[PDB]
C-alpha cells in the first residue's frame, strides 16, 4: 500500500535529506515539487500527490539539539515539503526520557499523517545505532508504534557504529537499542561503517568527509530497494511480499546488502552475480551459511543468459549456503532507470539472511561483557540512574542477546529442523 | 495499444483487486474494477479490433488468467502470517515451494514468451499474418501451460497442492500434513521424471 | 552474382552456335568452360569469406578429429558409466548432459550450442552430429560427416586407454614411494611404460598424419579459385586420412584393435590391484605378458 | 588439472616475481590483471579467473626476514595479486624450526587455496638449495605436503649452490635438503650457478648483477616448460603425462634442461637439435648415457624436415645414450608465441634424465665427507644441536645419498635390467 517514512537523529535526518534529494533528481520533478513536462511513474507511496502535482513526501521530521536540521530548514528543497511537524543528550536514557515526555503530541503528528493516508503498508525510520540523540529516543518510538499498531510493518535502515576503539557507554546504548530491535521490530537492514570505509577508500581517496559519500551510497541503496515500488513492477510491490521469504523466524530478521559497482563513475549476469557473491561487494563486513538470498537486477539484460547463469551457478557451487532446508536464492529484474545517464548499465542489489553477522554482534557482546565485568563505564550519569536504579535491564538485554546469538549458532546447523 | 493493455494489466494492478477477495456479489467486482473459483469479466471491445481478434482467444486468456490468480492466492495466503515451534518449519518447507512455483510461471512463461511475442507482432506488415501470429501465440501458451490433454496427469497435482495453502492457513495436525506433502511431492516427481524439452527448467529441485 | 550480368554474353555464344550448320566439340567445350569458370568462381568467392570455409574446417577438425582435446578429456573425467552396456533409454540424454556440463567449467561458455552427441560398449556406440550452414554448404555432405564420425570413434579409443594407463600409474606416486618393494613379488616389471610407449609412438604417428594433411589442405584452397578443384582437394584429403591412419580394413587395423584391447585389459588388472597384494593376480598377469609377446611378434608381420 | 604455485625464500620469491612479470608481459593483460581488448588463451592453471577477468595467480607468498619481499609488496604488479597469505636464520634447522611452529596457519593457507581450486594437478615451489632462510623450511613444508597429499604431484625448480669455495655448514644443509628431495618428491628439475655463469659471460659482459639475468633465463625456461599448458596443446596437458616418460625410478628423478639460443637478442630443426645436443647449451654443467630425453620446439617449423632430421640423427649417432632398454628421445611442438616480437623464430627446450649429474652430487659428497671427517664445520650452532643431539641424521642422509650415487652408477650399466 502506502509507506510512511520517519526520520530522527543527526545521521537519520542526513540520510533522509540525501534520499529525498536522490528521488528529486531521479524522477522528473522540480525542487519545489512541480512535475517537469519533459518526463510514467508512481510516486504515491513515499509522496502525497497534489493538484499542481506537488509530491510532498511522507517524511515526519523530529529534531533534538538542531544544528544540521537548521541547514535542512533553509534549502531549495524546503519548498518540496512543509508538513508542519518539526518539534524539539547523547545518552540512551536521555533520548528515551525526552521522547517519553512529548510522546502525545508526536503521536498526534503520527495520527495526523495516518489520516493523511487512505491505506498503509509500513513505517520506515531513518536512524543510526548509538547516534546519541537518536539512540534511546528511537527505541522509545519503536515501542510506541509496536504498542499502537500490530497491523503494519516496520523496516529499519541503520548502521553499526565502529569508531575503532571518550564515550564508553556506547556498547550499553547500542545493546539496549538492538534489544528493542530484535523484540519490537519485524525486519532489520543493518550496515557497517568499516565496510563502507573499505569501499570508499578503494573507490576514492577521501578520508575526512566520508559521511557525505556514505550518504550517497545509502541513497543509491534506498532507491534500489524501492525501485520495484517507484517504477511500476508486477511482483512484490508490497513490502511484506519482499520481506516474507527472507525471514522465517522472529529474532533472526537481520538483512545484509550488496551492490555490484564499488566505483560507479558488457557486464553480464554471470559477472554481476559472482561480484555480488563477494563480501567486498557487500557493505557489511565454523563455516557460515545463508538461510536465503534475494537479488534484484536493474539494467540492460538479455533474458536468455540468466537461465544459463543460474545453471552454472549451481554447477560451480560458488555460494555455500545450507540452513537445513530448501531455501535458495531469488533473482528478480527491475527497470533500468530513465531520466538519468545510464552508465554502468547493469547493476544488482542483494538481500540475504546470513548467520555471519552474529559474529559482529558477538564482538559488541565481547566488549559490553568486558565493561559489564568492570562496571565503571556507565559513568554514573543520572538519566540511566533514574530509568533503572538496579540496572537490571542491561542484564535482561544480555540474556536476550544470548538467546539471539544461540539462535544464530543453532541456525547454522542442519539440525534446525526443530526450533526454527 | 489495446492488446498491450490486455497482456499487461493481467497476464500489479490486479494484486489489489484479488486481495479483497481473500476477505461474493456480481456487482461489487464491477465497482472494484472501474476504480471453487471463477470470475465474471467483460470490458468494452471496439469493432475494428473486434474483427481482427477472435472471440475464442479471450476465453483462452481467461483460463490461464484464472490459474495465475490461484498462484497469487497461494503466494499471498501462506505469506501474511504473524512441538510448538514445529508449525513454523512447515511454513518454510512450503513457503519456498510456492515461490519456486511462482517464479517459474510468471517470469519463465508469462514474461519470456510475451517479450518474444511483442518482437513478433512488431514485424506484421499485413492484416492476415497478424491474425496468424497471435494464433501461434495461443497454441504455444496452450502447450507450455498444458490445458488440452494428459491434464489428469499434471494439473491435479497443481490443484491438490493448493489445498495446503488453505490447510496451513487454518491451522494456528502438523504430522498429517507432511505425510500428505511427501506423497504428492513424490507423485509429482514420479510423473515429471519422463522429461516438452522445457520441463526440466523447473525440475532443478 | 555476375552470372546475371554476363547472361546475354553466354546466350549470344549459344545462339551463335545455333546458326552454324557445323558442329565440333572443340568450340563447344570452350563455351561450357567459360561459363563454368564464372559459376565456380562465384561459389569460391562467397564460401571462403561469407560462409567462412577455413575456420569452419578448423572447427570440424577440433570436434571430429579431436583437434581440441581439452573438452573430450574433461568429458571422460565426467563420464564413466558407458564402460557398461547402455540402457539406450537414459544414456542418450546423459552423455549430452555430461558433455555440456564439462563445457560449462571453461571454454564455450558463450555460443555454439550446435554440437549434439548421438548414441545408437558405450564408447563403441557413441557418435556425434554437428550442424553447419546446410543451404550454404554442399561440400559438407552426410557421407563426409559419416567418415568423420568413424575417425572420431577411432580416436576416442586411443585417448581413453592412454588416460586410463597414466591414471593407473600410482605406483610411482604411492606404492614404490617411501617403500622398498620386493622385486618381482610386488612389482611386475612395471610394463605400464612398455604398454605406454607403443601407444605414445602411435599417437605421434597419428599426430604427423593429421598435421601434415591439414596444413596442405589449408593451402590448396587458397591457391585454387574455382569450386571444381576444391572438390578434388577435399576428396584427396579424406582418402589420405583414411588410408594413412590405417583405419582402413587391413590386417594391420585388426592387429591395432587387438593391441588396444590388451592395453585396456591390462589397465583393468592394476585398477583393481589397489594395494600391493597377490589375489591370484599372477595367473592373469602371466596371460597378459604372453599375449603381449605374441602381439609384439605380430608387429613384425606388418613390418615384413 | 589446475596447478598451485608456491614461493618462499629470497631467490624463490625473486624468480616467482620474475615469472609472474614474464607471464604478465607475455599474455595480453594489465599489471592489475585486466584483460586487454587487443588480444585465445587458457590462463586457468596458474591464475584464478575473475569477473572482470582478473587472473589472480595461484601464488602463496611466505616470507622470513623480508627485505626484497617489501620491494615485491610495493609494485605496479601488486594489484595483480592479493590472496592475503603473507606471513612472517640462515640455517637448515633454523628454517625447519621456524616452519615447524607455524605449520598450522600456513596449512590453513594451503587448505584455503585448495578450496579455491575445484580440481588439482600439482604443486610447484620456488626454492633455492642452501639459500639460508629457504633451506630447511622448504624441506619441512615438503614433508608436510608429502604427509598430507599422496594424490598430487610436486615439481621443483631449484639451483645448485656453487660460490667457488665463511659459511661452511652449507654442504650439510644442502645434503639434508636433497635427502628430503630424493625421498619426499616425485620429480626434480635442478640447475647450476656455474653453467648460467658461463652462458651469461658468453652472451653478455656482466659479472655483478648476474642474479637479475639469471632470473630472466629462469622465467624463459619456466614459460617454455609451461607453454603446452598455457597455450592450448593437445598432448601432455597434464603434468604427469610429461613427467611419466622421463622417470622410471623413484630416486633417479632429477631432470636437466637446455635451451637453444644462448643470446636471444633460418635456424632449422637439424641446427637446433644439434645445438641442443651440446652441454654448453644445457644449463647444467666412464661414459655417461641418458635414460630418456624429451624435446619441445616452438617456432616457425616446416613439418617435413623433422622426419628427415631424426633419420639423420640416428645416422650420425650424435647422441650417446643406452641405459639398457628402449627409451629414446621424444620430440614435440608447441605454438610460437604471439603478443611479443617473434625474433629468433625457432627455439627448443630439452628435458632429460642423464647420469652425469651424479658426479656433481659426488663433488658435494666429496666436500661434505671431508668436512664430516674433520667435524668442525657445523660451528656448533644451537639449532642443529636441538634438532639432533647425536647428529645421526647427517649419517642417515650420507647413507641415502650413497644409495643414490650407487643407483646412478648402476643405472649407467646395460645390466640395469634388474634393480631399476
Interface contact A420-B99, CB threshold 8 A = no
Structural element, H or E, at residue A159: strand A153-160
User: Using CA atoms, how far apart are residues C171 and C178, in angstroms rounded to an integer?
Assistant: 11
Per-residue cell: A1: 500500500
Backbone interruptions in chain D following residues (C to N > 2.5 Å): 39, 88, 165, 265, 285
* Nearby residues of A413 by Cβ (< 8 Å), 6 or more positions away: A324
Main-chain phi, psi angles of D204, to 5 degrees: -140, -170
Q: How many residues does chain C have?
A: 304
Residue ranges of A for the binding site for GTP? 130-136
Q: Give the pairing type, strands D122-126 and D153-160.
A: parallel
- Using the structure block, give the residue that is written with the C-alpha cell 605400464: C192
CB C119 within 8 A of CB C158: no
- Using the structure block, give the residue that is written with the C-alpha cell 526440466: B200
CB atoms within 10 A of CB A317: 8
Q: State how far Cα C235 lies from the chain centre.
A: 16
**From the CA atom positions of chain C, what is the Rg in Å?**
27
Strand order in the sheet with D187-192: D59-61, D3-7, D122-126, D153-160, D187-192, D254-259, D347-354, D290-298, D330-334
Q: Is D188 helix (H, G, I), strand (E, B) or coil?
A: strand
User: Using CA atoms, how far apart are residues D297 and A114, in angstroms rounded to an integer?
Assistant: 82
Cα-based angle D71, D75, D81 (whole degrees, multiple of 5): 110
DSSP state of D335: P
C303 sits in the region (left: phi over 0; alpha: psi -120 to 50; else beta) called alpha
User: Using CA atoms, how far apart are residues D276 and D260, in angstroms rounded to an integer?
Assistant: 6
DSSP state of D35: B
CB atoms within 10 A of CB D174: 22
User: Using CA atoms, how far apart are residues A207 and A330, in angstroms rounded to an integer?
Assistant: 36
CA distances from D343 to D202, D257, D337 (A): 20, 22, 10
* Nearby residues of B167 by Cβ (< 8 Å), 6 or more positions away: B177
Q: For every residue of chain B, which 3-state class applies, written as one string?
A: CHHHHHHHHCCCCHHHHHHHHHCCCCCHHHHHHHCCCCCCCCCCCCHHHHCCCCHHHHHHHHHHHHHHHHHHHHHHHCCCCCCCCHHHHHHHHHHHHHHHHHHHHHCCCCCHHHHHHHHHHCCCCCHHHHHHHHHHHHHHHHHHCCCCCCCCCCHHHHHHCHHHHHHHHHCCCCHHHHHHHHHHHHHHHHHHCCCCCHHHHCCCC
Structural element, H or E, at residue A126: strand A122-126
Main-chain phi, psi angles of D56, to 5 degrees: -80, 120
Pick from D338, D333, D335: which is nearest to D231 by CA? D335
CB D353 within 8 A of CB D252: yes
Pick from C111, C150, C154: which is nearest to C131 by CA? C111
Structural element, H or E, at residue D353: strand D347-354
Interface contact D51-A275, CB threshold 8 A = yes
User: Using CA atoms, how far apart are residues C61 and C144, in angstroms rounded to an integer?
Assistant: 12
Pick from D291, D280, D281: which is nearest to D412 by CA? D291
Q: Is D220 helix (H, G, I), strand (E, B) or coil?
A: helix
Interface contact C173-D150, CB threshold 8 A = yes
CB atoms within 10 A of CB A122: 20
CB A219 within 8 A of CB A22: yes
Structural element, H or E, at residue C127: strand C126-129
Main-chain phi, psi angles of B5, to 5 degrees: -65, -40
Per-residue cell: A90: 547523547
CA dihedral A354, A356, A357, A363 (to 10 degrees): 170
Nearest C-alpha in D relative to C194:
D326
Half-sphere exposure (Cβ direction) of B79: Cα atoms closer than 13 Å: 26
- Using the structure block, give the residue that is written with the C-alpha cell 536512524: A127
A238 sits in the region (left: phi over 0; alpha: psi -120 to 50; else beta) called beta
Q: Is C294 helix (H, G, I), strand (E, B) or coil?
A: helix
- Do A and B touch, 3+ Cβ pairs within 8 Å? The answer is yes
Nearest C-alpha in A relative to B86:
A418
* Nearby residues of D22 by Cβ (< 8 Å), 6 or more positions away: D219, D220, D222, D223
Contacts 24+ apart (CB under 8 A), A387-395: A387/A93, A387/A96, A387/A97, A388/A93, A393/A176, A394/A172, A394/A175, A394/A176
Structural element, H or E, at residue A155: strand A153-160
Pick from A145, A139, A143: which is nearest to A122 by CA? A145
Q: Is D160 helix (H, G, I), strand (E, B) or coil?
A: strand
Q: Is D132 annotated as a binding residue?
A: yes
CB A211 within 8 A of CB A170: no
The subunits that touch chain D, with at least 3 C-beta pairs less than 8 Å apart, are A, C
Interface contact B91-A418, CB threshold 8 A = no
User: Using CA atoms, how far apart are residues A335 and A227, in angstroms rounded to an integer?
Assistant: 8
* Nearby residues of B182 by Cβ (< 8 Å), 6 or more positions away: none
CB D36 within 8 A of CB D158: no
- Which is it for the CA torsion D46, D49, D55, D56, positive or negative? negative
CB C209 within 8 A of CB C242: no
User: Using CA atoms, how far apart are residues A9 and A184, in angstroms rounded to an integer?
Assistant: 19
CB D60 within 8 A of CB D85: yes
Instruction: Cite the beta strand spans of A205-301 per DSSP E.
Output: 254-259, 290-298
Pick from B79, B72, B181, B12: which is nearest to A245 by CA? B79
Pick from A84, A77, A78: which is nearest to A62 by CA? A84
Residues of D numbered 181-200 whose beta carbons fall under 8 angstroms of chain C's beta carbons: which are they? 183-184, 186
CB D200 within 8 A of CB D214: yes
Nearest C-alpha in A relative to D116:
A318
Maximum Cα interatomic distance, chain B, rounded to a whole number of Å: 66
Resolution in A: 7.6
Q: Is A187 helix (H, G, I), strand (E, B) or coil?
A: strand
The subunits that touch chain C, with at least 3 C-beta pairs less than 8 Å apart, are A, D
Q: Give the pairing type, strands A3-7 and A59-61.
A: parallel
Pick from A299, A300, A297, A243: which is nearest to A273 by CA? A297
CA distances from A37 to A30, A34, A43, A228, D228 (A): 10, 9, 16, 23, 64
Interface contact C166-D150, CB threshold 8 A = no
Selected residue of C100, C101, C104 to mutate for chain A interface (largest A Cβ count, 10 A): C104
DSSP state of C175: I
Q: How many residues does chain A have?
A: 420
User: Using CA atoms, how far apart are residues A209 and A213, in angstroms rounded to an integer?
Assistant: 7
Interface contact D248-C176, CB threshold 8 A = no
Strand partners, A274: none
* Nearby residues of A385 by Cβ (< 8 Å), 6 or more positions away: none
Selected residue of C103, C106, C110 to mutate for chain A interface (largest A Cβ count, 10 A): C110
User: Using CA atoms, how far apart are residues B9 and B17, in angstroms rounded to an integer?
Assistant: 11
CB A93 within 8 A of CB A384: yes
Q: Is D60 helix (H, G, I), strand (E, B) or coil?
A: strand
By CB neighbour count within 10 A (0-12 exposed, 13-18 middle, 19+ buried), where does C297 fall? exposed
CA distances from D222 to A8, D75, D334 (A): 63, 22, 14
**From the CA atom positions of chain A, what is the Rg in Å?**
22
Interface contact B82-A419, CB threshold 8 A = no
Q: For every residue of A23-64, which 3-state class applies, written as one string?
A: HHHHCCECCCCCECCCCCCCCCCCEECCCCCCCEECEEEECC
CB A384 within 8 A of CB A378: yes
CB A121 within 8 A of CB A413: no
* Nearby residues of B57 by Cβ (< 8 Å), 6 or more positions away: B134, B135, B138
Pick from D187, D322, D325: which is nearest to C189 by CA? D325
Listed in sequence order, the DSSP H helices in A283-414 are: 305-316, 357-374, 382-387, 392-411
Q: Is C281 helix (H, G, I), strand (E, B) or coil?
A: helix
Per-residue cell: A117: 493516508
Pick from D289, D243, D270: which is nearest to D412 by CA? D289
CA distances from A155 to A4, A188, A214, A254, A331 (A): 10, 6, 20, 10, 21
Per-residue cell: A5: 517514512
By CB neighbour count within 10 A (0-12 exposed, 13-18 middle, 19+ buried), where does B25 fall? exposed
Per-residue cell: B172: 494456528
CA distances from C86 to A386, C93, C95 (A): 82, 11, 11
User: Using CA atoms, how far apart are residues D280 and D285, in angstroms rounded to an integer?
Assistant: 8
* Nearby residues of B194 by Cβ (< 8 Å), 6 or more positions away: none
CA distances from C55 to A264, C45, C52, C59 (A): 39, 15, 6, 6
In A, which residues are within 8 Å of C100 by CB distance?
none
Pick from A360, A227, A393: which is nearest to A282 by CA? A360
CB A296 within 8 A of CB A276: no
Interface contact A326-B205, CB threshold 8 A = yes
By CB neighbour count within 10 A (0-12 exposed, 13-18 middle, 19+ buried), where does C114 fall? exposed
- Which is it for the CA torsion D267, D268, D270, D272, positive or negative? positive
Strand partners, D293: D352
* Nearby residues of D96 by Cβ (< 8 Å), 6 or more positions away: D136, D137, D139, D140, D383, D387
Maximum Cα interatomic distance, chain A, rounded to a whole number of Å: 65
Q: Give the pairing type, strands A347-354 and A330-334.
A: unpaired
Structural element, H or E, at residue D192: strand D187-192
Nearest C-alpha in D relative to C190:
D248
- Which is it for the CA torsion D188, D158, D334, D328, positive or negative? negative
Main-chain phi, psi angles of D186, to 5 degrees: -105, -30
User: Using CA atoms, how far apart are residues C118 and C152, in angstroms rounded to an integer?
Assistant: 12
- Using the structure block, give the residue that is written with the C-alpha cell 517524511: A59
Strand partners, A5: A59, A124
Amino acid at each position: 500500500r502506502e509507506i510512511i517514512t520517519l526520520q530522527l537523529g543527526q545521521c537519520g535526518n542526513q540520510i533522509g535529506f540525501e534520499f529525498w534529494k536522490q528521488l528529486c533528481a531521479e524522477h522528473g520533478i522540480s525542487p519545489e515539487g512541480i512535475v517537469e513536462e519533459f518526463a510514467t511513474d508512481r510516486k504515491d507511496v513515499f509522496f502525497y500527490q497534489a493538484d499542481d502535482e506537488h509530491y510532498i513526501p511522507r517524511a515526519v521530521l523530529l529534531d533534538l539539539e538542531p544544528r544540521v536540521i537548521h541547514s535542512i530548514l533553509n534549502s531549495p528543497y524546503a519548498k518540496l515539503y512543509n508538513p508542519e511537524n518539526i518539534y524539539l543528550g547523547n545518552n540512551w536514557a536521555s533520548g528515551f526520557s525526552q521522547g517519553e515526555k512529548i510522546h502525545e503530541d508526536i503521536f498526534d503528528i503520527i495520527d495526523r499523517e495516518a489520516d493523511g493516508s487512505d491505506s498503509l503498508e509500513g513505517f520506515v525510520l531513518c536512524h543510526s545505532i548509538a547516534g546519541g540523540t537518536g539512540s534511546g529516543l528511537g527505541s522509545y518510538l519503536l515501542e510506541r508504534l509496536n504498542d499502537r499498531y500490530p497491523k503494519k510493518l516496520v523496516q529499519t535502515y541503520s548502521v553499526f557504529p565502529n569508531q575503532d576503539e571518550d564515550v564508553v557507554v556506547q556498547p550499553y546504548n547500542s545493546l539496549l537499542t538492538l534489544k528493542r530491535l530484535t523484540q519490537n521490530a519485524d525486519c532489520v537492514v543493518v550496515l557497517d561503517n568499516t565496510a563502507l570505509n573499505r569501499i570508499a577508500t578503494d573507490r576514492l581517496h577521501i578520508q575526512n568527509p566520508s559521511f557525505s559519500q556514505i550518504n550517497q551510497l545509502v541513497s543509491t541503496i534506498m532507491s534500489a530497494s524501492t525501485t520495484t515500488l517507484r517504477y511500476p513492477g508486477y511482483m512484490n510491490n508490497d513490502l511484506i511480499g519482499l520481506i516474507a521469504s527472507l525471514i522465517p523466524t522472529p529474532r533472526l530478521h537481520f538483512l545484509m546488502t550488496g551492490y555490484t559497482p564499488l566505483t560507479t563513475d558488457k557486464t553480464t549476469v554471470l559477472d554481476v552475480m559472482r561480484r555480488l557473491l563477494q563480501p567486498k561487494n557487500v557493505m557489511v563486513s565454523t563455516n557460515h551459511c545463508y538461510i536465503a538470498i534475494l537479488n534484484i537486477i536493474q539494467g540492460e539484460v538479455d533474458p536468455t543468459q540468466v537461465h544459463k547463469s543460474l545453471q552454472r551457478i549451481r554447477e560451480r557451487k560458488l555460494a555455500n549456503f545450507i540452513p537445513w532446508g530448501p531455501a535458495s536464492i531469488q533473482v528478480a529484474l527491475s527497470r533500468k532507470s530513465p531520466y538519468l545517464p545510464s552508465a554502468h548499465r547493469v547493476s544488482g542489489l542483494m538481500m540475504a539472511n546470513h548467520t555471519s553477522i552474529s559474529s559482529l554482534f558477538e564482538r559488541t557482546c565481547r566488549q559490553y561483557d568486558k565493561l559489564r565485568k568492570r562496571e565503571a563505564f556507565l559513568e554514573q550519569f543520572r538519566k540511566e540512574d533514574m530509568f533503572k536504579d538496579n540496572f537490571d535491564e542491561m542484564d535482561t538485554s544480555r540474556e536476550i542477546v544470548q538467546q539471539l546469538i544461540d539462535e544464530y549458532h543453532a541456525a547454522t546447523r542442519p539440525d534446525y529442523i526443530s526450533w526454527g | 495499444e489495446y492488446l498491450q493493455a490486455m497482456r499487461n494489466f493481467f497476464l500489479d494492478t490486479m494484486y489489489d483487486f484479488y486481495t479483497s477477495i481473500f476477505d461474493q456479489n456480481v456487482s461489487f467486482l464491477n465497482v472494484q474494477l472501474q476504480e471453487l473459483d471463477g470470475l465474471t469479466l467483460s470490458y468494452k471491445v471496439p469493432w475494428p479490433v473486434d474483427i481482427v481478434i477472435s472471440l475464442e482467444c479471450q476465453k483462452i486468456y481467461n483460463q490461464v488468467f484464472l490459474l495465475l490468480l490461484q498462484i497469487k492466492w497461494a503466494k499471498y495466503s501462506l505469506d501474511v502470517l504473524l512441538q510448538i515451534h514445529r508449525m513454523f518449519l512447515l511454513r518454510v518447507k512450503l513457503m519456498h515451494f510456492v515461490n519456486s512455483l511462482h517464479n517459474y510461471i510468471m517470469t519463465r512463461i508469462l514474461h519470456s514468451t510475451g517479450l518474444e511475442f511483442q518482437h513478433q507482432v512488431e514485424e506484421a506488415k499485413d492484416l492476415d499474418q497478424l491474425i496468424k501470429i497471435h494464433y501461434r501465440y495461443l497454441s504455444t501458451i496452450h502447450d507450455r501451460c498444458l490445458l488440452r490433454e494428459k491434464v489428469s496427469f499434471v494439473k491435479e497435482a497443481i490443484m491438490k497442492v493448493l489445498n495446503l495453502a488453505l490447510m496451513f492457513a487454518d491451522g494456528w495436525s502438523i504430522e498429517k500434513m507432511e505425510s500428505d506433502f511427501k506423497n504428492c511431492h513424490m507423485f509429482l516427481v514420479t510423473i515429471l521424471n519422463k522429461a516438452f524439452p522445457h520441463l526440466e527448467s523447473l525440475a532443478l529441485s | 552474382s555476375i552470372l546475371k550480368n554476363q547472361e546475354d554474353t553466354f546466350a549470344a555464344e549459344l545462339h551463335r552456335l545455333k546458326q552454324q550448320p557445323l558442329f565440333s566439340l572443340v568450340d563447344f567445350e570452350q563455351v561450357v568452360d567459360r561459363i563454368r569458370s564464372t559459376v565456380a568462381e562465384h561459389l569460391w568467392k562467397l564460401m571462403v569469406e561469407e560462409s567462412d570455409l577455413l575456420g569452419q574446417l578448423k572447427i570440424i577438425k577440433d570436434f571430429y578429429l579431436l583437434g581440441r582435446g581439452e573438452l573430450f578429456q574433461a568429458f571422460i573425467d565426467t563420464a564413466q558409466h558407458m564402460l557398461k552396456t547402455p540402457p539406450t533409454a537414459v544414456t542418450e540424454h546423459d552423455v549430452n548432459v555430461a558433455f555440456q556440463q564439462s563445457a560449462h567449467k571453461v571454454l564455450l561458455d558463450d555460443d555454439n550450442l550446435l554440437p549434439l552427441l548421438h548414441l545408437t560398449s558405450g564408447w563403441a556406440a557413441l557418435g556425434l552430429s554437428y550442424k553447419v550452414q546446410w543451404p550454404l554448404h554442399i561440400l559438407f555432405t552426410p557421407a563426409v560427416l559419416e567418415k568423420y564420425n568413424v575417425v572420431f570413434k577411432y580416436l576416442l579409443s586411443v585417448r581413453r586407454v592412454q588416460a586410463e594407463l597414466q591414471h593407473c600409474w600410482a605406483l610411482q606416486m604411492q606404492r614404490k614411494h617411501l617403500k622398498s618393494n620386493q622385486t618381482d613379488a610386488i612389482k611386475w616389471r612395471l610394463r605400464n611404460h612398455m604398454a605406454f610407449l607403443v601407444d605414445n609412438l602411435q599417437y605421434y604417428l597419428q599426430v604427423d598424419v593429421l598435421e601434415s594433411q591439414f596444413s596442405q589442405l589449408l593451402h590448396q584452397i587458397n591457391s585454387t579459385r574455382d569450386f571444381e578443384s576444391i572438390r578434388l582437394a577435399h576428396d584427396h584429403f579424406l582418402s589420405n586420412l583414411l588410408a594413412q591412419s590405417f583405419i582402413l580394413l587391413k590386417p594391420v587395423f585388426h592387429c591395432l584393435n587387438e593391441i588396444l584391447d590388451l592395453c585396456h585389459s591390462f589397465c583393468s588388472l592394476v585398477s583393481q590391484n589397489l594395494g600391493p597384494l597377490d589375489e591370484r593376480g599372477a595367473a592373469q598377469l602371466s596371460i597378459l605378458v604372453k599375449g603381449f609377446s605374441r602381439q609384439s611378434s605380430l608387429l613384425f608381420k606388418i613390418l615384413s
